[PDB]
Each structure stands twice: as structure tokens, then as C-alpha cells.
Amino acid sequence: TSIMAVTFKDGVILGADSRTTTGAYIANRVTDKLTRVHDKIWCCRSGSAADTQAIADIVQYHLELYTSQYGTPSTETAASVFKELCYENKDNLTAGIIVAGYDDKNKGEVYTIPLGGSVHKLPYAIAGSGSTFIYGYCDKNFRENMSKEETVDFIKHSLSQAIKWDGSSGGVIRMVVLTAAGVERLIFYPDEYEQL
Amino acid sequence: TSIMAVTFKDGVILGADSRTTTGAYIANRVTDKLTRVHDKIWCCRSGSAADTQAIADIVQYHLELYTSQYGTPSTETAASVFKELCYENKDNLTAGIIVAGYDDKNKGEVYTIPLGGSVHKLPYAIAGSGSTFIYGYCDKNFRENMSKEETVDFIKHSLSQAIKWDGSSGGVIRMVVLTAAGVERLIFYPDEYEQL
Amino acid sequence: SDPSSINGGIVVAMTGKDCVAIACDLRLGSQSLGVSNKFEKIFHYGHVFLGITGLATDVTTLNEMFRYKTNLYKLKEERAIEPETFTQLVSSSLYERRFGPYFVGPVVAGINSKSGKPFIAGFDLIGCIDEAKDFIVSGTASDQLFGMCESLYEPNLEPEDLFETISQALLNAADRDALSGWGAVVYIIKKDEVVKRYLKMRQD
Amino acid sequence: TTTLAFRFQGGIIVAVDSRATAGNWVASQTVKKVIEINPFLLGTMAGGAADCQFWETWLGSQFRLHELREKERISVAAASKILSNLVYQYKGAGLSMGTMICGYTRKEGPTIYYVDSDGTRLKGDIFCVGSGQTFAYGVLDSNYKWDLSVEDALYLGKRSILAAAHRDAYSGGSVNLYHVTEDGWIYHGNHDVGELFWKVKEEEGSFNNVIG
Amino acid sequence: MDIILGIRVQDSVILASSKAVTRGISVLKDSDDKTRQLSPHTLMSFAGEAGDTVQFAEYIQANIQLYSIREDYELSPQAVSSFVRQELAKSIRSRRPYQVNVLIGGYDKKKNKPELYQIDYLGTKVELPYGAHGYSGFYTFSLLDHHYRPDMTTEEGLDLLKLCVQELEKRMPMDFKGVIVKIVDKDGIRQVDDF
Amino acid sequence: MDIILGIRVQDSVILASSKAVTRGISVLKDSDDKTRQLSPHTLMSFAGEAGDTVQFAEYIQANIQLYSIREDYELSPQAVSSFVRQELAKSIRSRRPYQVNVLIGGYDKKKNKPELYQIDYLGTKVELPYGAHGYSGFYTFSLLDHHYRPDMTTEEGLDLLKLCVQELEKRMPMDFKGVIVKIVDKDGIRQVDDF
Amino acid sequence: QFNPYGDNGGTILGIAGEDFAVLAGDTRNITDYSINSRYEPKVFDCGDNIVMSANGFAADGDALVKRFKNSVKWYHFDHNDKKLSINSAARNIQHLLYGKRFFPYYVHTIIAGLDEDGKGAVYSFDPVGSYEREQCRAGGAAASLIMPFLDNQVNFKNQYEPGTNGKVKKPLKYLSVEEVIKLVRDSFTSATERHIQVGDGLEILIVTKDGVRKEFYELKRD
Amino acid sequence: TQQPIVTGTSVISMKYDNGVIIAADNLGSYGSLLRFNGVERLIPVGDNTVVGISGDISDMQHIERLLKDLVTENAYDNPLADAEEALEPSYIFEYLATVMYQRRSKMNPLWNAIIVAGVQSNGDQFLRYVNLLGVTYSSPTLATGFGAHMANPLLRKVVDRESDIPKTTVQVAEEAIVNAMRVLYYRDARSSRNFSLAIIDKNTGLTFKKNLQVENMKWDFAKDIKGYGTQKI
Amino acid sequence: TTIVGVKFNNGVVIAADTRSTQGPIVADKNCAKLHRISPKIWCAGAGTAADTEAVTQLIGSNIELHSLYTSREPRVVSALQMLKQHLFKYQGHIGAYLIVAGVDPTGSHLFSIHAHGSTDVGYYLSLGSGSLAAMAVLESHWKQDLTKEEAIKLASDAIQAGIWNDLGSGSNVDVCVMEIGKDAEYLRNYLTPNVREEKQKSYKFPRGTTAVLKESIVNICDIQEE
Ligand SMILES: *[B]([O])([O])[C]([C][C]([C])[C])[N]C(=O)[C]([C]C1=[C][C]=[C][C]=[C]1)[N]C(=O)C1=[C]N=[C][C]=N1
Ligand SMILES: *[B]([O])([O])[C]([C][C]([C])[C])[N]C(=O)[C]([C]C1=[C][C]=[C][C]=[C]1)[N]C(=O)C1=[C]N=[C][C]=N1
Ligand SMILES: *[B]([O])([O])[C]([C][C]([C])[C])[N]C(=O)[C]([C]C1=[C][C]=[C][C]=[C]1)[N]C(=O)C1=[C]N=[C][C]=N1
Ligand SMILES: *[B]([O])([O])[C]([C][C]([C])[C])[N]C(=O)[C]([C]C1=[C][C]=[C][C]=[C]1)[N]C(=O)C1=[C]N=[C][C]=N1
Ligand SMILES: [Cl-]
Ligand SMILES: [Cl-]
């Protein structure tokens, strides 16, 4: 799995590959790892598919109930609910989740939640088995307050390399753009991103 | 350990960090992992210090005896001797070696020898625990027929990132330039390469 | 299971004014079963005394081995071996079985016949030499012996006073160990006389 | 440990050693391995020091409550069964106990029950319990009769513990004697093995193997 | 095998050894003689792992008989015991060690003294007035500590031995089917056919 | 504990059970009665892990005695055996199962027939003419297969039982210190004091 | 896998006199080959003229002392400020220890004080609660080094009177407080020399009818 | 029972004449990967206490929330919350120490080593340690993990015993701490150059320094080191 | 164990503590850890004590024979090479962890050796259980161009750090200075900061205190004449 989230001038963009593996067999080559817990709060999932789905489902429920009572939740609030599940059930879970969302007050925000259940607020975040191969690239190439087009290129190039080197990553590169304008889905096929 | 060798227009350059670790304790912060098996055939060492030294010592002996009988050996020949030791003693060794050398006929050449004992001739090679974090960077930034100054910058930037992310890597960046002109040693200290 | 504590036993050695003392218990057992109360652990080759604790078959084997080697030494050298030289011979002999060692805890004691200087030494099972000025301890109650010797000992004790000190060190250490006791022997050693005394102690 | 108890004409003789060990280290030579449950009941201790102490002390509280409720001395049978039923609840948890419950009542006569942390409860005339039980059995079985005097019976018990104290590395220290009769138990002193061995050797002409 | 005993009296050495051979759940034989004559005045009883016991005993027997013929002379019990100890002390650090414990009872015709040696499979030798291997000693040593007297006659030794066997038959779980008793003295070796 | 036998003849059921109690290396007792009377015409012998055996037997005894008082009526051997089997079948899937094997010998006063049931610790019940638990059956079933006739008298049953015990004493390694024999018939339960 | 136990080293020593009692212990605290503290008090005044120390795993040691101090407080509340006698304190500690029989306090406990006749008293416990009154007891890491020395120099074991040769024993004359403190200091100096976990400092608590006094002595810091 | 995932290395500290100093680097490691470079591991409580934490970071964040909640709870129905009845270092420590030992006693520990540094109401210096086992101890100098092996030796040369505390100034003490942090960067494979330092003085109060770096490093001698023995070039 | 090596202006110095330990017990309080390979090549050893002694003696012996064969003073690199190859062959099972130093016709040298056979070069080094305490001192106080007096001070201070802070080290400080163009001076017990205080009591017993069963003269002399 290769997943990342990057803040930029107009908001935040989530990115992911589409490969699910049972050992060396690709059980699904067109998986959607970018999942929605609220209108403009999404997450990237890595680790156990069952665990991260079960967690994401529970978070979506908690935020739906929050909204009904207290109105739209902050991205910090969403990350806290993810944490509470991951930390208190650390013994029985294998989940590495990146939470990303867009407020109008706070703009684009990114929270990463590794195995332990700790929370880390960052300008951008990378995770999954394939992320190891792009620490060097992402650190050298990330700037704050990038444009939409620049951020899409940064994620596209980054995940392209992660896919190239990691056997657990592959297929299409899915992306989800979160801004004031709304929610846009992007897809990039192998013929496009391999020649980069 | 973060080690690499890169061919360029005038020859080949070897690069390495200087950290030796017993668990989390740095047993030596100023180690020289770039070692000489012949005048213009050097190697980068990763894995067990004892194994790679014992191997390097034996290779230096074999090439010294080769020279006395048959004259200067090729870099391919040196790599073959390394392989023969690593392959035939694969069960008892933990050594990841990169062989680099300069002929006048063949110019700059690089052979990488991972754990198994297999040989791979490449334009450039990376190895050691810290190399995982720079596959993305090196693949995107390597060009053939670079200049000396460009190649030094490529290695300096690459190992800088490998050191930044890998706990097993650190200290000074040592380099060894191999050309027709001769053998040049370079050193780069933390204050220099960290601010890159 | 642990070879060094199947049979049990202890040895202790001390220095005094122009004299040395070496002592040992008499027990041989098979774990909890007490088998023999006449198993002496101190041997001598000329004027050099050797005490050995640990696995009893090795105690016997090494005694026979050092008798063998010291006898050949004497025939060739035309003189008795000295404590300093013998110490080196024990270390050599043990280390040659580095990776298949004798499970023992030897202790050398004696007076150099030329210089007159009192000498003691201890070893681990694989050869390492401990050459102490004051005292050496060995066996299943080595901890107890260390405590007794460290508190009771003073330098330059006369032979008859040194006897009391070493005897009390052994006896009280043995009485706090399940695998030591069943009798005790003490050797007092001067430059040209050696007295051997059997001690009365509790037989449990 | 070596503990024994046997029935005879003059009631019951109980004899125990005093040693406690942790591995090869002798932790204590002055251990009280006989528990005075009441003026009529004694309990012996072998195995885990804490398990035996705690539950045999607890045991006296249950008996005291029985005679408060029933206005009558508890039977040795009921006494031993309270302990056996208790340890059976803990079976598997890792309790380590080998005990005799000894006493005398009008209805039962002199009675000895062997009680065990496995749950085993056995009535019997002679029992030896502990690491040195085999040594004590040798002396007892060859010299036991029903028609023994209180003086001779006391010595046989003392001598049997001495035998085991000598040979068993995990037994020793001293010998505690008790004599249980119609009118209760009577303590018969602490006997140091360091002095008792030489005394017995000289007078009895035994232990000719050892030098003295 | 199981139980082997030994006792040295005034003028002889008496060895007692069980008759049973048990392989698993059944007693295949109840009349087995767990002993070999090494020389006219030296007897060795044995107990340990199946096969190893007899193989070792006969191997020793052959070696001592070879010595007797070569020198036309009987080795002392002390000398034979030392030879046996060395073979076991050599054995313990072998690829597959001999798993055998022995008692050596002999009469020294030079010193006119009976001698009993106890040696285990490690090569641990001790001279004793009375000895035993395995669990036998746990029951018998207490009795011998009480009754033994160095100057006992052979008849007194047999009575003390009967008291030991009676105790074993009372308190040991395994039925060892009684013992074969043999006496070693100045006149040689003989078997007590009624015991 | 060790050996427990049972045999059903013409007009009675005979149970034989060993007297020894061995804990480890020593035989603590040689006169132990490994049986409990459940009712006037029903006897249960038992063998298994220490403690569990007696605890289980007395627990069953208490329950059957409670039934007897409540209904003023003795349950049939078949009914008692079924109750016991269920308790063991319940037990086997518990936190800590009862590790006990039993034989239930009873005389049914309604049908005027002796009945022998064999039940193991899993709750495996079978009605048999003759039965055994542990290693006992390995020696005894061959003899019973040959000699047993179903019309034997009680005296003939005891002789056939003596032949079984003799074989056990010959071929079993463990000394079980003989057996206590009890007969169950129309007149109730009695112990054969000389065997 | 997680291991709930640890070993903080240290060593303690209790000696009972004719009308007094002492409880000593070194002040060093350790894990593996490192020193945590050169002065971490280990022997505590628990009130009612009772001193206590629970040597071994310090977390369990502190927990136990804390719970016993608590027990003394509630003993006063529930029984009209009655003084908790040393024998009663001992039995109470047994129940605290055995209460965790199947997940024990990994400590060797010793308490000291005066009995109800005013005579000196020392009680000793194993980890699971077994206890016994003693005249002398060392506990902890260097217990094996110190006890034999105390058998010899406090109870005159293996000592006889000159001229008689083994016939007449050395009489068991009583020891003063000055004489006992000498034996305590020598015991710890000797233990420090041969045990790596013993050193830094020695703290002694003396108990008399007048109350509880303290004395401190330096030990070798290597 | 668990295993620690995202981990924090050494916390070091000492006493001086008028107060206490404590320090810890800003790294969150994921095994050998130096994953998170901006992690604050010194957490102040009021204006008189600083709690330094090492080990599992998720458990640190849980402890951080407990302390945050402790301040809130102490303010409830407490008119003297910012005065006489404010949280003392000794109170904060004992609370943590209770929790740590309780969690180890349920076989579900908080995988941390903690050092509570502060100054009491009466001006007395407070410095005490507690870890996943519930083990506690105090000393003029305290350190966790690698700091215990490397920092303590250096810090003990300044303050070796109690009587050395009044003789140690704040300037001398901070110098020793900063040096120790440099030594740890040379020699700990799971440390970073960036760190935080906190001083709690009885006169000048709490000073919290962020974004400090290890400086004045000696590396020049590396150029002269060649091969591993016989090599000359 | 704490052992260190420090280069200086005109040579090299090594130092060591004097504590040997079996588990938590001290076997020897004044143990000698500085071994002589040749007159001007000395090494300090940590780990298994019999191994550091044995491997030093063997190499020291072969070095002496080599020196006689070649008619040259022995070199440190020769001792280094012979030690590493021996240790590598035994795959770490010979537990010797050495700091090898010395002066020879090439100059002054300082190396370290580990049990598996790996060697390291340096101006300052430390090995053993107290190496972390020692290295902390070395990293704080080491500079280039140290004098002889400064290097001895730095070396002994690094050992002291081990003595005081590491439980696997203690007692005394041994030093050996090897200067170019001079005899190597071996300073046994250079510092003695751990003398035991006078005991409170004397434990000399009255004569006759111990009970005796038998006495006898032991014949240590040979068979006599006449
Ligand atoms: B990715 O590779 O981490 C991926 C993300 C997931 C949310 C779809 N995980 C998987 O594919 C996992 C295996 C795995 C691989 C690498 C690291 C951790 C875990 N696969 C599954 O959970 C799975 C596989 N087959 C069927 C169902 N679930
Ligand atoms: B590097 O980190 O791989 C490094 C290269 C070596 C040639 C100096 N290896 C080491 O530092 C190894 C440990 C190791 C770390 C990471 C991967 C593989 C191996 N260290 C040693 O061999 C060593 C450590 N301490 C003393 C001696 N040798
Ligand atoms: B005895 O050996 O059974 C003895 C009786 C006990 C009541 C004092 N037990 C022990 O000595 C046991 C160890 C042991 C030895 C042999 C067999 C079984 C058990 N010792 C302890 O229980 C103990 C208690 N506190 C401190 C040290 N040892
Ligand atoms: B030091 O602590 O590394 C020291 C150096 C040695 C050369 C004196 N090592 C020892 O003291 C070793 C530690 C050790 C213990 C157990 C196994 C292996 C190593 N001790 C001994 O070599 C030793 C122990 N007891 C007797 C003799 N030698
Ligand atoms: Cl999915
Ligand atoms: Cl290297």
C-alpha cells in the first residue's frame, strides 16, 4: 500500500494506489483506499482491510451522529475519534490511517495515525509499505502553499515511485481533492504514470 | 548503513556513511566503509563488519597475487572473486557489497553483490539499510554521463536523505573518486550536508 | 542437569605470615542423595597443593592428569614443580578443552621453595587465573565463602591463628549450603612442614 | 523436609526437621514445621512454607468456629476434610502442600490423616512426608510395634528424622518432638542435629561409616 | 535395570541385584542375573539403559580376562575399579555415552581385605562400606547407617541385607521380583541359592 | 490410582480394586479401599488422578443418597449409571474436568439380574459381563474371554478373579499390594476379608 | 512479551538485641548494570515503634510498605488507638502477601521492633507470606554473603572454648547496641567488596523503648 | 501486554542550587525509521512542573491527556487553584506513579519511562523517576534509556552527592545538560539533533526553550581515518 | 569491564579497570586486564577472561617467533591481522573484545577488535560494559594534539567513569604508556581510589576454638635414604 495526504494553498489532496494482496496474489487490482467519513473529511487506509473498514465505518457513524447534534465536526475531531478506536484497541488492530479534511476556518489539515494509536498533525503525510521508498523524494520535493496542479504532480510522481519499487502497491493511482469548491475525484492509469 | 556507487563521464565515484552500530549504540561514528582491494578497484561494505572485512582482505590478497602473475585485473574479475566467496559461503555470511573500479578500456564500472551472492552490473547501485529510503530519489535524479561535480552532488544529496531517515546511518559522508587522473578522497561533515 | 552442582562441594585457600592454608569439605552426592563422606578434594604434587570442586568425575580425572604431568615434569626437570609454574600448567590444560570443558573449579596453594613467598590462585572451568594476595574460594557455596573470608580475614596471620580463621570460614559457609558439608579437612602449610587437621562439624 | 507421624499404644508420635531451602541455599535451620492448631490437634508442614503456614493457621480458625457453634471438639476426620476440601478448590492453581493432621478424640481414638495439595486425603497408622521421607521410612518400618513405651516411641521418631537429616540434603537443622495423648499434645523439646548426631553415634554404636 | 546393592563386612563383600526385566508394560523375565565375574575374586553388578548394561559389562569382563592371561596374575579390586572408572570417564564425552552404573565387589588377596567400589555412568568412583545405585539408596542407606558395623560377619551381613530388601519390597512401587545374592571372599565367588 | 476389575456372573457382581496408594517414589499406604457404596444394592469403584477420585465418588454418593431419602426408593443400577455418565460427560467440557474412571456394580431387585457398567472420564458408558480400567484390561480380558461363562456361580467367579490377579502380579511392573474384593447380590454388599 | 517483574538489587539486615532492635539496608538502587540512585531510602519508620523493609522489586516493595503503613492507620481507627504489637503486625503482613499468592509481591520482607515484654524482635517473610520470628536475618542480593557471618559472630556457631577442644561450647553472652552496630557495618563493608549491587551508603534504624533513631554511613561507590 | 511502536528516546535531568533542569529530543522513531521529526516530549504542568516522557508515543499522548485533565479537575471548586492549592510536582508524580503500577498489575502497562522535574511550594527541588513497571527513585541526576548509561556519568561529575547541589549554579548546570545532549547525538542511533530544554527555578520560574540544536560538534578528525587496519589510501 | 585507548602527540596510551565478575559476584578485585603482546605492543581485553588471555598469549608467542624470523621489531598491524583472522575463524565463539595499541618503526597505532573479527581504527576508543560511560567522557574532553600528560589524564578519567557508574567495572585503574623512541612504561595500579576502610572489629579467634578429630603429619618429602 502507498498512501499520502498533502495540504496546499486551496486545501488538501488525498492519494492512494489500488492494490490489495493476499501474500503475492493480488486479490483486487482496482481497490478504493480513499474513503469518506464525512462530506469534506476523508481518510487513507493501510494495513488490514477488515480492520480499517470496520474502523472507518464506526467513525462515519460517530461523525454522522455528531453532525445531527452539534453540526459539522472539525478535522481534529475526526482524527480524535480514529485515535480513540486505534489506541484503545491497539492489541487487536493492524491499521495505519491518514485523516485529511477541509474546514473554511482551518482550511486544509492532515493527521496521521500509525500502528500505536498516536496522532501527529503534519503539513503532509505518507504511509503504507511503499512509503518507505519515497521518504527521500517527498522530503526534498515538498513545499508549503503549493497550487492544485503542483500538488497533483507531487502526489502523482511520489506514488509512481512507491508503486515502482513496492510489490504490495500497484494498479491505478486514485486521488481526492478537498477544497471550498467541493469534492473532486481523479484517476491516473499505468500508461500515464509509469512513463514519468 | 547507506552506501552507493555511481558511474559518470570520467569514471566512477563511491559513497558511504560512517556509522557502525551495536543495536542502538553507535560503536563507531567515524568508520571508513570505502575500502581498497586494488589501486583503482574499491568496494562499499554493508552488513556484518567482520564478514565484509574478512572478505575484503581475502579479495585484496587474491588480486595482489593475480597482479603479480597476470597484470592488472579488470573490475569484472574483482567482482567475480567477491561473488565466489559470497555465493559459496552464503549460509555463514551476512555481506552486501558494491564493487566499483576504473579501467582505461572499460572506463567506470559498477557491480552490486547482495546477500545471495548474485552479481548485477549496473550504471549505478545503492545498498545498505538506508538505501530503501532513496530508491525513489535516486531513480528520478540519476542520469548517464554526468560530470564529476554533478555526480558528487547526486551522491551527497542521496546519502544525506538516507542518513536523515535511517537510524543505522550517520556521521560523515565519505567518498572516493576513481578516474584516469588518479584516486581522490572526499569528506563532507554534518553541518554541510544536513542543510541541503 | 547443571554439571557444576550435581555432586556439590567447596574449597577455600588463604595466605598468612610465612604460611598458606587450604581447606575443603568431604561431601559427594547425587543431587539430594548424600553418597560419600570421605571424598577429599585436596591433592598434592610435591609441595604444591591443588583443591578441585565441581563435577566429581572431572575432579578425579584432573587429579590423575596433573599427577601424570607433574611426574613427567620432575623426571625431565630434575626438580619439583613450583606453585607459580603449576598454576600456568593448570590454565594451559583447561583451555585446550575450550569448547568441551572440564566442569571444575580448581584452587592452587603452596610456598615457593626458593623465595619462600606464600602463593595462592584460583581458576574458572576454562583456565582464567585469579591470583589473589588474600584468599581464594570455590564451589557451590562460593557466595557464602566470599562473605566469610571478606569479613574474617586479616593479613599476616600466624599459622595457628590462620587455622582458626580458615576453619571458621569453611564451616559456617558449608552450613548455609545444602550440597556442602559432611566433614572437612584443613591443611596448614609452612616452608618445610605440613599439618593436616580433620574438623568436627554437623553431619546434615 | 522430613516429617513423620505414627499411631501406637501410648497415642501418636509426631517428629519433624527444621530446614528450609531455596535451591541449594539454606534459608533457615530454625523453622517450626509443627503447627499447634489447638491443645488436641497438630498439623505438619511440607512443601511450600507459605501455603502450609497460611492454610494451617487458617485451619485453626475454622475449628475454633466449629466448637463455638457445635459446643463440641471437632473430629480429626472433619478437621482433615476441611483442609482437603479447601485445597481441592485451588487444584491446578499451583498450591504445594504435604501435611499430616494428627489428633485424638473419644469417638475416633488416636487418628492421623495425610492431606495433600492434589486433594488426596488418607487415614493411616504410619506416614512420612517430604524430600527425606524414604530415609525415615526405613528406620520406622523395621522398628515399629504397637506395644511401644512413650519413651521408646519418642526416640524412634527422633532417630528416624536424624537418619533423614543426615542423608537428605534438603533436611536438617534440628528435631522437634511432640507426643499426642488422651489429654492433649505434649512438646518434647528442640534437638540440634549438630549435637544429637554425635550423641546418638557414641551411645547407639551406629553411623560407624562416619568418623568421630 | 532397577535395584543393585552392595555391603562390605569383616571378611567379604555381598552384592544383591534384582531379577526383573521390564520392557514397557510387561515383565519379560523374572530370573535375570545382573552381574559378571571379572576375575576369580572380583564381581561387578550393573544397572542402566537397556543393551548398554550387558554390552559394557562383557566388554570390561573381556579386557580383565585378557589382562589375567597376559600377566598370569589377578589385578587388585582397586586396579580394576580404576580401569572401569576411566572407561566410563572416557565414555561420557563420546558421541553416544555408555548409560551404565556399576558396583565392584572384590577381595584383595594381598591385603586380605574386602573392598566395595561404587561407580556411576559419569565415571564417579567412591570406596564405601555399603553402597547402592538408583532409587535403592533412598530407602536402604538409613537402615545401613543404623545397623552396619564394620566387623560384622557374613551371616550378619546377609540378615542386614534381608532387612534392606524387605523395606524395598514394602515401599518401592515397582515389583522387582526379588534379588540374586552373591558373596565375594578369600575363597572366591559363590551364589546364595535361597533368598 | 491403579487397577480396578469387575465381573458379572449368574446372580451377582464382583468388584476387585488394588490397595496401594503411591505418590511418587514411596507407597504411602497398602490398605486403601477404592470404592464407595452408592446405595444398598449398588457399589462404585474408581481410579484416576489423585484427589479427583474420592471427591467425585463421594459427590455421586451424596447425590444418590439424597435421591433415596427424597423418594424412599432405590434407583436401578441402569439409572445410577446414566446419572454418573452425564456428570462425567458434563465434566469433560469444564474448566477443570474430573479425571476419574469408574466401574458400577449393582443388583437390580426388580429384574432380579446383576449388572456391571464401565464408564471412563469422558463419559463413555458400556454394559459388560466383565470390565476393567487402565492397563488392567490388557492382561485380564484374554483370560476372561476364555473362561467366562455367563452362568457361573459366585465361587466360580472368585476363582476366575484369582486367576486374573495372579496374572497381574506376574506381569505388571507396579506392585499394587493386592486387591480388596466385594460382592454385590440380592442380599446387598459384602467384603471378602481373605483374598 | 511483557515481563511485570524487575530486580532493583539492594540488601537488608535485621538484628535483635536484649532490649533493642536494628534494621539496616544499603541506599543503592539499580537495574541491570546501571545505578539509578546512590541514595534511595529502603528501610522505613511505619509508626508504633515498628520499622520495615521490603527488598527486591522496588515497585512491589514500595506498594507493600505503603499498604502496611495504611493498615497501621486503620488499626488505630478501628480499635481505639491501640498500639499494634510487633507479632500482630507480622501476622497482618502475612495476609497482605498471601492475598497476592497467585501474582506475588516479588520481595523479601523484614520488620523489627520490640515485643510486649520489651525485648528486641525481628520477623522475616518470603514473597508469598510465610513468616518466622528470628534473632538474626539478612535479606536481598547479598544475603548469602552476610548470613553465614552472622551465624558465626552473633550465635557463636562452630565456636568452642579453648582447652576443652570441642567439648564445651562458647557461651551465648548478650550483645550491646554498640557491639551490634560494629557487626552491621562490617557486614555491609564486606558485602560491598564482593557484590556489585551493594554500595554507595548504609542507613541503619535503631529501635528502643525511647523511640526510633537513625544512623548513616558511607559505602564504596564503585 | 503489547509492544511499543512509535518510540521516544532519552530524557535527561539534574538539580542545581535554585532549581532543576530537564531535556529531551524531538524525535518519534518507528523502529530504525526516524519517522516523526517534530515531537515535543517535555510537557509542562502549571508553572512549577515539567514531565519528560520516553518510550511509546501513543501512551505518551494518553498520559498528556491525563495531566491536562488533572489540571482541569484541580481547578473545580478550588478558589486557591492558582495559589496555595495549586498542583505540586510531588502530587503530579505520585498520581502517575499510581497509574503506572496499577497498569503493570493488570498486565497492560503504559510502555514509558517518566521523569517529573519541578520546584515545591517551600522552594525545595523535586526530581523523581517512574517507568512501565511502577519502579520509582530519586537522585541529584536522573536519566532514561541511553541517557542513563551516557548522560548520568557526565552529570554526576558536576553533582556527585547532595552537598554538591548548593555549589552548582544554573549556568554550570545548563552547560552540562547541553553537552550531554551532544554526546547522545554522537552515540545514540535513535536520537536527533533538535531538542527541547526546560528550567524550573524557585526565583525566575519556568523557562521553556524550544527548537534548540546540538552545536560545536567535532568531526574534522574523521578525514584522517582510513580503512579498518592496514589500508593507507 | 572498562577499557580505553587514547592517541597523543608522540605515541599512544591504554588503560583498564581491575574488576572481574561472575554474574553479580566479584571474582577478583585487583584483576590485570592489560596484556603484553610484545615489548612495545600492548592490548587491553574485555569479555571472557580466559579467551582474552589465551588469544593474546598465542598471538604474542607467534609475534615473537615472527620478530626473530624477520630480524625486525614487531608491528601493530601484524598483531591486528593475526588476532582478527583467528577470531573470525572461530565465528565469535572465542569471546575476546580487544583494544590493540603500540609503537613500531611505522609509528604509533591504536585499533579495536571484536569477537567476530571486525577491526576499527581511531584516535580514541573504548570497549566493555562501561564503554558507554567512558566514551561519554572521551567525547566531551578529547581534542587533537594532546600531550602525554593530558592523554594519561583523559584515559584514567574515562576508566573512572566506568568504575563509578558501571556495575561491571570497579576497583583500580591500570595504565600503559607507549611513546615513540622510548620504553613502554606499564603503570600497574596507577590510581587506587577504592581502599577498604578499617573494620570495626577484629575476628581473630582464641586458639582451640575449632573442634578437631584427628591430626597427622603429611609427608611432602621424597623417599628417604638409609
Ligand atoms: B496495503 O497493502 O497496506 C493494503 C491496504 C488495505 C487497506 C487494502 N493492505 C492489504 O492489502 C492487506 C495485506 C497487507 C499488505 C501489506 C501490509 C499490511 C497488510 N490485505 C488484506 O487485508 C486483505 C487481503 N486479502 C483479502 C482481504 N484482506
Ligand atoms: B551498516 O549499518 O550496515 C554497517 C556496515 C558495516 C560494514 C560497518 N553494519 C553494522 O554497523 C553492523 C550491524 C548491522 C546494522 C545494520 C544492518 C546489518 C548489520 N555492525 C557490526 O557488524 C558491528 C557492530 N558492532 C561491533 C562490531 N560489528
Ligand atoms: B521441606 O523441604 O519441604 C520444606 C518445608 C517448608 C515448610 C519449610 N520446604 C522447603 O524448604 C521449600 C523448598 C523445598 C525444598 C524441598 C522440597 C520442596 C520444597 N522452601 C520454601 O518453601 C521456602 C520458603 N521461604 C524461603 C525459602 N524457601
Ligand atoms: B569485563 O567485565 O568484561 C571482564 C573482563 C575480563 C577480561 C576480566 N569480564 C569478566 O570479568 C567476565 C565476565 C563474564 C562472566 C560470565 C561469562 C563470561 C564473561 N568474567 C570472567 O571471565 C570470569 C568469571 N569468573 C571467573 C573467571 N573469569
Ligand atoms: Cl479495502
Ligand atoms: Cl568496518
Ligand SMILES: [Mg+2]
Ligand atoms: Mg508494484
Ligand SMILES: [Mg+2]
Ligand atoms: Mg470405557
